[PDB]
Structure formats: structure tokens, C-alpha cells
Curated annotation (Swiss-Prot):
This is Endothiapepsin. The chain holds residues 90 to 419 of 419 of the full protein. It comes from Cryphonectria parasitica. One of its GO terms (biological process) is proteolysis. GO terms for molecular function: aspartic-type endopeptidase activity. The keyword Protease applies. Keywords: Aspartyl protease, Disulfide bond, Hydrolase, Protease, Signal, Zymogen. Disulfide bonds join 255-290. The active site is at residues 35, 199. The gene is EAPA.
Length: 330
């Protein structure tokens, strides 16, 4: 089997991407944030504290003839940005772009933190990291990909995120028309439950490539590119007037600037992030100070190849017995 679904930016900055997901019978379509950095499929629901729902579409398990309460199961998750959610668990039928999993754990939120409430466009998350990170207790549950894997034509999914435009998540096949050149594959460590890999270096603009190992995660659920302070300083030094602002919480730059590209290495191959991808616009409405899309990972504890990086590539998440990651230009 295979599936194919369009993923759409939630706003003009590509702050996140939503993908429609069918849950239950009859189908209830919710727009979920596909997140290769976590492993829980959770939704706003009829059980979510009413004051914490503000415009989201909810899953109502009582209206699904295939929903079953997973007795005794609870979940609770905290994300790197300080947001959180928690609740109980149903199993139900879940379909993504024509690919159907029966008995998928659908984690129903009883509580969500303010950032989730305040974002009316995201109805929940669909985790695509390794199932070892799943938070369901006392019986850990499998991700959608993990459940689908054996049925897929090939045990893979691909992320093809757009810049200020829709893109595609495919399951079970590689669309050879969606990228240019070849896909370069690179080793993955699953030891921390992430799609963790090691970039071979970077370049800033038309500058020379610096060969250096950068361990990080391919994370579709993180907006920006978070790299070591040395690398980030080298990038922003090429932008006149750019500075790290403690009050804002990262590097800012004059909105009048033209940003240089940023290249990262995948083995001997190179992925080029155009300068415009690194612009996250005014820090506040009307400001001429703009927020940078490349930021320091110092104090995160891990480097994160988030959407800014991933949207410059066609990315293969290869879930073979020994997982690997593939990157192609597009």
C-alpha cells in the first residue's frame, strides 16, 4: 500500500505545516502537524477542556463506530518549545492520503497548553519519530508509520515541504519526479528516538565549505534551523546589522537586508537553503527588525534540522531494519 497527502503552511511564514488526517467511522478530518521529532498522535477532542479550545476541529470518539477506549491508558507530553498536552487514549481507524491503519492509538487531549489553544489551525500532532518516544502509559503505543510499515510497498515515508507553498508527505514510495539529481543517504542513530544524523559541514553564501561533523535531528515539527553557536555566528556575521538579541530570544536582522544562502552537507552532497527561507519577518507587527531562521542550539542540547532546512530538500525517512535518511535537492 501507499499514501500521499498534501501538507500546507499554516501562515505566511511557514511556521508549521498541516496535513489532513481521517479519524474514525464515519471519517472525522482533522488537520495535524506531522512531527518527525515526536511519537504521539494526539488530537483536540470532545474531552478537551472547553476553555482550552479556540477554533480547532475536534475528534469526538463517541461519534465513531470504530473508536474503542484503551482502558487505563493515559498520555502526557512536553515539547522543546515549552508547550504540552495530556489526556486519555482511544484506538480507531486512521487514514492519511489513502493509507489506512486500523487500531491506531489516537490520544485524546483533556488538557493543552496555551500555545496550542492560541493556534486555531493545528488540530493535533501526528508523530513520526521512533515509537520508543511514545508517551502512552502503562502500555507504550506505536506511531502511525510504525503500524503501517509492514503493509507499505517500501518501509519509507518522504517529506517534501514547500517554501511559502504546499508540499507533500508520501508513505510507502519514493516519487522520483519530486527531486533533482540523486538522493544521498546517510546513517541514522535511533538511540535518542529521533531521526538523528551527522551533517558533513556547511557554507555561508558563496563562501568556502567548512568540513565539520554536525550531529542533529531531522525534525519536521520544528520551524527553524538550530545549529552550534559557532556556525550561527559565522552565518549572521555576513548580514550587516544582524545581532543576537536576548530580549527577543535570538538573532534578529534589519528587514532591509538581503540574506545569504546557507549550505549544509549530506555526505559528499550539498543542500542549499536560499536566503529568503531564513527570513521570519518582523519581530512584532510594524517593526523593521526581522527574526532569523537560523538560531543557536546552545542550551537546547541538540542541533535541529527543522523546516527551514528540510524544505530546501526532498527528504526520505527510510524505516528499514537499519533506518537511514536520504536528502535530494529539488
Amino acid at each position: 500500500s501507499t499514501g500521499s497527502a498534501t501538507t500546507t503552511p499554516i501562515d505566511s511564514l511557514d511556521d508549521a505545516y498541516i496535513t489532513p488526517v481521517q479519524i474514525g467511522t464515519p471519517a472525522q478530518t482533522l488537520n495535524l502537524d506531522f512531527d518527525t521529532g515526536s511519537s504521539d498522535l494526539w488530537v483536540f477532542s470532545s474531552e478537551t477542556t472547553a476553555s482550552e479550545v479556540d477554533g480547532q476541529t475536534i475528534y469526538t470518539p463517541s461519534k465513531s463506530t470504530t473508536a474503542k477506549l484503551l482502558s487505563g491508558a493515559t498520555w502526557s507530553i512536553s515539547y522543546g518549545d515549552g508547550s504540552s498536552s495530556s489526556g486519555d487514549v482511544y484506538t480507531d481507524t486512521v487514514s492519511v492520503g489513502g493509507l489506512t491503519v486500523t487500531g491506531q492509538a489516537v490520544e485524546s487531549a483533556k488538557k493543552v497548553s496555551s500555545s496550542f489553544t492560541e493556534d486555531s489551525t493545528i488540530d493535533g500532532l501526528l508523530g513520526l519519530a521512533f515509537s520508543t518516544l511514545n508517551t502512552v502509559s502503562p502500555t507504550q503505543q506505536k506511531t502511525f508509520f510504525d503500524n503501517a510499515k509492514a503493509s507499505l510497498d517500501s518501509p519509507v515515508f518522504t517529506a517534501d515541504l514547500g517554501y511559502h507553498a504546499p508540499g507533500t508527505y508520501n508513505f510507502g514510495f519514493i516519487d522520483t519526479t519530486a527531486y533533482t539529481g540523486s538522493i544521498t543517504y546517510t546513517a541514522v542513530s535511533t538511540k535518542q528516538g529521533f531521526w538523528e544524523w551527522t551533517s558533513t559541514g556547511y557554507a555561508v553564501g558563496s563562501g568556502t565549505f567548512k568540513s565539520t561533523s554536525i550531529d542533529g535531528i531531522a525534525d519536521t515539527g520544528t520551524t527553524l534551523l538550530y545549529l552550534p553557536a559557532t556556525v550561527v555566528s559565522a552565518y549572521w556575521a555576513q548580514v550587516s546589522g544582524a545581532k543576537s538579541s536576548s530580549s527577543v530570544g535570538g538573532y534578529v536582522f534589519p528587514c532591509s537586508a538581503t540574506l545569504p544562502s546557507f549550505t549544509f552537507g549530506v555526505g559528499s552532497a550539498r543542500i542549499v537553503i536560499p536566503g529568503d527561507y531564513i527570513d521570519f519577518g518582523p519581530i512584532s507587527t510594524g517593526s523593521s527588525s526581522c527574526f532569523g531562521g537560523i538560531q543557536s542550539s546552545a542550551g537546547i542540547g541538540i542541533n535541529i534540522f527543522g523546516d527551514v532546512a528540510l524544505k530546501a530538500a526532498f527528504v526520505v525517512f527510510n524505516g528499514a531494519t537499519t533506518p537511514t535518511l536520504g536528502f535530494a535537492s529539488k
